[PDB]
Amino acid sequence: KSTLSTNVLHADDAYALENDVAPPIHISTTYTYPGTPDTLQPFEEDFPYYARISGNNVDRAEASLSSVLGAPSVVYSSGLAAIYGLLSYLNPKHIAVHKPGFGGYSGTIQIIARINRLTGLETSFIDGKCDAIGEGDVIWLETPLNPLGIAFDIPFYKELAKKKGAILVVDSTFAPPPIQDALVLGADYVVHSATKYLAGHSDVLAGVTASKDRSKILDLKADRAYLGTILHPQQAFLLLRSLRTFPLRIAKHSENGFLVAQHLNKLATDEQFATSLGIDSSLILEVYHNSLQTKEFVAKNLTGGHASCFSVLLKSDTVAKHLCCELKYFHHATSLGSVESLIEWRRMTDSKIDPRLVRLSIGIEDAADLIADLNRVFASLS
């Protein structure tokens, strides 16, 4: 009955151990045992007395996260910690991922290599078929895709996974609910880097996995106790603080992402519009964004908004470098999902990638200011 704005604020009320309005930071590693000599009662998976196994700050953060995700959730010290935990738990023989040249988070490929070192896990590529995938194998669908910001059809891959007896994991980092609900669309598990949108202020590393199957999430929590990857109390406090404003922030990100992507696409494709702004439309070759895909499934996947991190292919590496250095409201930096807008020249970190490609992460500024900034730089290059 209550909606997201209310639930992020009150989902943890039942988990409060004290009268503090803001959650306390239960920073202690260890907690004294209750009980007297007579009542002292010998009894570790829900052991609440050691913070590397379980803790109140994590409990409250997971309550709020589960309200966002609509399912039992397990929170980790980073997105890659969540991914490593999930893939080591599932222990598939085969995994299908997006081909690395096309896109997909490089850290996921590095985790697959580290698991392959141990298990021989074999990689194939997502191709609409996934012939190599069988029973207990994993389809790892990252959508929207890092760095392009375009979407894939989750229900389609759920039907493939179902036919094959395989497991569909969606890395939904670029579109958390309410923009996309990967679990409702059929994903067996969903993973997010909460470092990005959910925390949102570039000051928390965190990962989260969710599933409608609570017993699997409990297994993951048990494993987390020994992989050593629980989110610590101080970070769980800041993550929970962020979640309080997540419904407001994510709505603004989505609106801004649509507006900025659409403006850039209009510049690239409408020579009269560009000229009206003092801009040579040839500076932008292509804009990638979910709103520019012509496929009907995209609006059935991203039911509640738009990606705010997406890429642009520019005319040259010169244009890309000027754009990354000269914007007033976009800092040249990696990561995404921050309150402030960011831009990244993808070639910085990757020698194989086309030096014309830049990735934008739209923050919660006034879109008219972001568009005026972009216009100023593009005009200076015309």
Ligand X SMILES: *Cc1c(COP(=O)(O)O)cnc(C)c1O
Taking the C-alpha atoms of residue 79 and residue 261, their distance in angstroms, rounded to an integer, is: 26
In 3D space, the residue among 244, 238, 216 whose CA is nearest the CA of residue 77 turns out to be: 238
Q: Which of residues 155-174 bind ligand X (CB under 6 A)?
A: 171, 173
- Identify the residue among 122, 340, 350, 354 touching its own copies (CB under 8 A): 340
Provide, rounded to whole angstroms, the least separation between the CB of residue 292 and its own copies.
25
Looking at beta carbons, which residue is closest to Mg ion? Answer: 13
- Which of these, 206, 191, 228, lies nearest to 86 by C-alpha position? 191
User: Can residue 77 be called a binding residue for ligand X (CB under 6 A)?
Assistant: no
**CA nearest neighbour of 88 among 220, 232, 228, 225:** 220
> Under rule CB under 8 A, which residues in 301-330 are in contact with its own copies?
328-329
Q: How many Å apart are CA 41 and CA 62, to the nearest integer?
A: 29
Q: Does 344 bind ligand X (CB under 6 A)?
A: no
Residue placing its CB nearer to its own copies in the complex, 15 or 297? 15
202 binds, among ligand X, Mg ion, its own copies, none (CB under 5 to 8 A by kind): its own copies
From candidates 1, 13, 33, 272, binder to Mg ion by CB under 5 A: 13
* Cα–chain center distance at 110: 17
Over the window 78 to 107, marking each residue x when it contacts ligand X by CB under 6 A and - when it does not, the resulting string is xxx------------------------x-x
Least separation in angstroms between residue 291's CB and its own copies is 22
* Residue 221 and residue 260 in contact, taking contact as beta carbons nearer than 8 Å: no
Binding mask 3-22 for its own copies (x = CB under 8 A): xxxx--xx--------x-xx
- CB neighbours of residue 115 within 10 Å: 18
Burial of residue 178, with CB atoms counted within 10 A of its CB: 0-12 exposed, 13-18 middle, 19 or more buried: middle
Of 349, 362, 382, 352, give the one whose Cα is nearest residue 107: 349
Rg (CA), the chain: 22
Per CB under 6 A, residues contacting ligand X are 78-80, 105, 107, 142, 146, 171, 173, 193, 195-196, 205, 207
Residues that bind its own copies (CB under 8 A): 1-6, 9-10, 19, 21-22, 201-203, 241, 244-245, 248-249, 252, 328-329, 331, 333, 335, 338-340, 342, 363-366, 368-370, 372
